[PDB]
Enzyme design. Structure first.
Site, mmCIF file in Angstrom:
data_model
loop_
_atom_site.group_PDB
_atom_site.id
_atom_site.type_symbol
_atom_site.label_atom_id
_atom_site.label_comp_id
_atom_site.label_asym_id
_atom_site.label_seq_id
_atom_site.Cartn_x
_atom_site.Cartn_y
_atom_site.Cartn_z
ATOM 1 N N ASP A 142 -9.412 26.156 -1.913
ATOM 2 C CA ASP A 142 -10.283 24.810 -2.069
ATOM 3 C C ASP A 142 -9.531 24.634 -0.139
ATOM 4 O OD1 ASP A 142 -12.821 23.191 -0.761
ATOM 5 O OD2 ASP A 142 -12.171 22.061 -1.440
ATOM 6 N N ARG A 146 -8.573 18.527 5.215
ATOM 7 C CA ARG A 146 -8.984 17.312 4.107
ATOM 8 C C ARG A 146 -8.351 17.174 2.795
ATOM 9 N NH1 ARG A 146 -13.311 21.125 2.931
ATOM 10 N NH2 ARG A 146 -13.142 21.733 1.577
ATOM 11 N N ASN A 147 -8.082 18.608 2.715
ATOM 12 C CA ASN A 147 -7.355 18.846 1.415
ATOM 13 C C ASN A 147 -5.784 18.284 1.691
ATOM 14 O OD1 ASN A 147 -9.012 18.419 -0.361
ATOM 15 N ND2 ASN A 147 -9.492 20.633 -0.095
ATOM 16 N N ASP A 160 -6.316 18.737 -4.067
ATOM 17 C CA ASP A 160 -7.695 19.732 -4.028
ATOM 18 C C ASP A 160 -6.892 20.969 -5.409
ATOM 19 O OD1 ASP A 160 -11.037 20.353 -4.514
ATOM 20 O OD2 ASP A 160 -10.865 17.881 -4.729
#
Ligand SMILES: */C=C\C(=O)Nc1cc(Nc2nccc(-c3cn(C)c4ccccc34)n2)c(OC)cc1N(C)CCN(C)C
Length: 315
Positions: A142, A146-147, A160
């Site tokens: 992932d 954003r992570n 994450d």
């Protein structure tokens, strides 16, 4: 033939930490910004506290403890690690606070003050963390802007790890960040993470743009089949864009290795203006406050003389 995992899992009392504000809200969970004080150690540690909303979902409890399992087992400067868990009615995950937030939001907020040197350095650090995960035979699955979280403008770490899995392990997906082989055949590899790394780089270079904006995900698999790819960002020399393109090759073993991406971006970071073309690159500066007053404001705590970052709290 895997080696025994002797990581320590640390259990913290709820009385040891307090929640100051809500960072984010989600059906599965709520993330808080807090202070953690270990008992009789005289230190205050800024933390993010992850709470799933209810115990009621069996998958959900399995989900957060699997995440705790992975975070407890990594140790690297470009990987977020777990301080501990609290065994409340609902399980709480306690991790180091990254005060400047996720890189996606940071890049959007600060597009006007972000220089080529920071962008290429972030690319090196992400590659380093991903390469550590590969050393640990961990496939993230992932990886995205954003992570990636910002400890300081100079320092970023990957996060994450819930869907993180071992490489040969049997076993709302984000299709846009996914290797094609992942999309078609649920194949996941370090080299499928390399693809995701390309998209993350493209996000940073586009200052937070959405990939394939306005394109339905169902469509995305076919687009990639045709050989369409993400467009070359304006600030990007062909040298940088070409690196992105190699991560998006169909032959997964054709794609670059994370240890190679470290090398290449590191070389570029020695002459940043030769590889990223950014208006007023020299002028720009990004605020990087080290000091106790910055924490007092951030934690809304009068006394932050005893503040210590997780990276300096070693057990
Ligand atoms: C991409 C959103 C984001 O990260 N926002 C954010 C994050 C932090 N710091 C931080 N540190 C460790 C862990 C987290 C974290 C973990 N998870 C699963 C989160 C979900 C949602 C939000 C944060 C999460 N975050 C931060 O520290 C001060 C601030 C911050 N802000 C204020 C931006 C908020 N926007 C979402 C509006």
């Amino acid at each position: 033939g895997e080696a025994p995992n002797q990581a320590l899992l640390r259990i913290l009392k709820e009385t040891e930490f307090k929640k100051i504000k809500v960072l984010g809200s989600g059906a599965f969970g709520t993330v808080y910004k807090g202070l953690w004080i270990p008992e009789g150690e005289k230190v205050k540690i800024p933390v993010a506290i992850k709470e799933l909303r209810e115990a009621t979902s069996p998958k959900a409890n399995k989900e957060i403890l699997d995440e705790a399992y992975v975070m407890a087992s990594v140790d690297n400067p470009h990987v977020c690690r777990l301080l501990g868990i609290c065994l409340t009615s609902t399980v709480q995950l306690i991790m180091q606070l990254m005060p400047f937030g996720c890189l996606l939001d940071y890049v959007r907020e600060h597009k006007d003050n972000i220089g080529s040197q920071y962008l290429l350095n972030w690319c090196v650090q992400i590659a380093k963390g991903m390469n550590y995960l590969e050393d640990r035979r961990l496939v993230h699955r992932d990886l995205a802007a954003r992570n990636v979280l910002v400890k300081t403008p100079q320092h970023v770490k990957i996060t994450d790890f819930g869907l993180a899995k071992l490489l040969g392990a049997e076993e709302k997906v984000p299709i846009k960040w996914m290797a094609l082989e992942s999309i078609l055949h649920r194949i996941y590899t370090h080299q499928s993470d390399v693809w995701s790394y390309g998209v993350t780089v493209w996000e940073l270079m586009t200052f937070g743009s959405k990939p394939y904006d306005g394109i339905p995900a169902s469509e995305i698999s076919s687009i990639l089949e045709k050989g369409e790819r993400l467009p070359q960002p304006p600030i990007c020399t062909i040298d940088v864009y070409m690196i992105m393109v190699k991560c998006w090759m169909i032959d997964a073993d054709s794609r670059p290795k994370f240890r190679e991406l470290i090398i290449e971006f590191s070389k570029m970071a020695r002459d940043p203006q030769r590889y990223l073309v950014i208006q007023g690159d020299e002028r720009m500066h990004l605020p990087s406050p080290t000091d106790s007053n910055f924490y007092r404001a951030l934690m809304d705590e009068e006394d932050m003389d005893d503040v210590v970052d997780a990276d300096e709290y070693l057990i």
